[PDB]
Structures are given as structure tokens and as C-alpha cells.
Amino acid sequence: MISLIAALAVDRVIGMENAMPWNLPADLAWFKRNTLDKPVIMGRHTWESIGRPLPGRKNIILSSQPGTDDRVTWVKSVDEAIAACGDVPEIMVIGGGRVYEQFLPKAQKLYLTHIDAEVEGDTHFPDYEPDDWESVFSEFHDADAQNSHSYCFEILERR
């Protein structure tokens, strides 16, 4: 099935090719933990932000333009993206905003990071009626020396 994993700031602002706009260390850790050994689908920008292949995962870049790195898979359509995933049990969609929007309706799970931070940006995570999902895990964390904002991890399953 397909899952989306995203970092969200107040009002759902995301940094589309960034996360919940920023790059909280604790969040990147959670992100690795939950995407390792699974294929990850991302748009060009996010790839660019990342700058290298994410190790331990099959990197699939969804983009209309030709690739520039033979170490990852370049695809030009959601159909191709999925096929390249083969028959794994879970596909992780990592953003940005446009890719979230194309995959959200097909998704069955959401791995979210709620960061208590006001940030301005024009991009937000797509809307999802909270009444259609079910929270199965939550873990709140206060701001620390490493993470300047508090954040809360949450996993939801489509009901």
C-alpha cells in the first residue's frame, strides 16, 4: 500500500522540498527509521534538497525532466513510479507538495510530524478530513538543545 510521511508546521505549512519547512534533527531520525528498506518516491526539488541517494532505500524521482544520476530511478509518471516499486508491502511518498497531492487519495497511512512553529510559506500539506483516519500512535517531545521547536510524531491509518 502507499504511505505519505511529512513534517508539518502550524496551519499545515510544509517546506515542499524541505519538510515542515525546516530540518529538525529528531525528525530526520524518525524519517530514516520509518523509510529505511522501503522505496521512497519524491519530486525533483526534494531530490535536490536532499542532494544524494538516500541509503538503504530505493530512490524513485518523479520528474518530467531527465535524470542526472544513474544511482536512482527517474520516472515521469505516477504509473511508472508505482510499477518501479514492484510488489513491496509499503511505498513511502516523501514529498513535496505536488507529489503529496497526487498521492494522498491513494494513501492508506500518514506518518506526520507536527512541529509547533509558525512559518510562512505558500505551500501546505493537502487537507484531509480528520474523521477519515485513525490515530494509532503519538509521541510528543519538548524543544531541546538540538530541536528548537517541540514536535509531535503521529501515525494515522485510513479507516
Residues at the binding site for NADP(+) are: 7, 13-19, 45-46, 63-64, 76, 95-102
Minimum gap (Å) between residue 151 Cβ and ligand MTX: 9
- Where do we find the cell 542526472? 68
Residue 10 or 29: which CB sits closer to ligand MTX? 29
Residue 75 or 154: which CB sits closer to ligand MTX? 154
Q: Is 47 left (phi over 0), alpha (psi -120 to 50) or beta?
A: alpha
Residue 74 or 151: which CB sits closer to ligand MTX? 151
Minimum gap (Å) between residue 157 Cβ and ligand MTX: 17
Minimum gap (Å) between residue 32 Cβ and ligand MTX: 4
In the bound complex, which residue of the shown chain has the CB atom lying closest to ligand MTX?
19
Degrees to nearest 5, angle at CA 112 with 38 and 73: 30
Q: Is 12 left (phi over 0), alpha (psi -120 to 50) or beta?
A: left
Cell of 8: 508539518
- Where do we find the cell 520509518? 34
Closest CA to 29 of 134, 123, 141, 126: 141
Minimum gap (Å) between residue 10 Cβ and ligand MTX: 15
Residue 37 or 131: which CB sits closer to ligand MTX? 37
Which residue ranges make up the site for ligand MTX (CB under 6 A)? 5-7, 18-19, 27-29, 31-32, 46, 49-50, 54-55, 94-95, 113
Helix (H) or strand (E) holding 40: strand 39-43
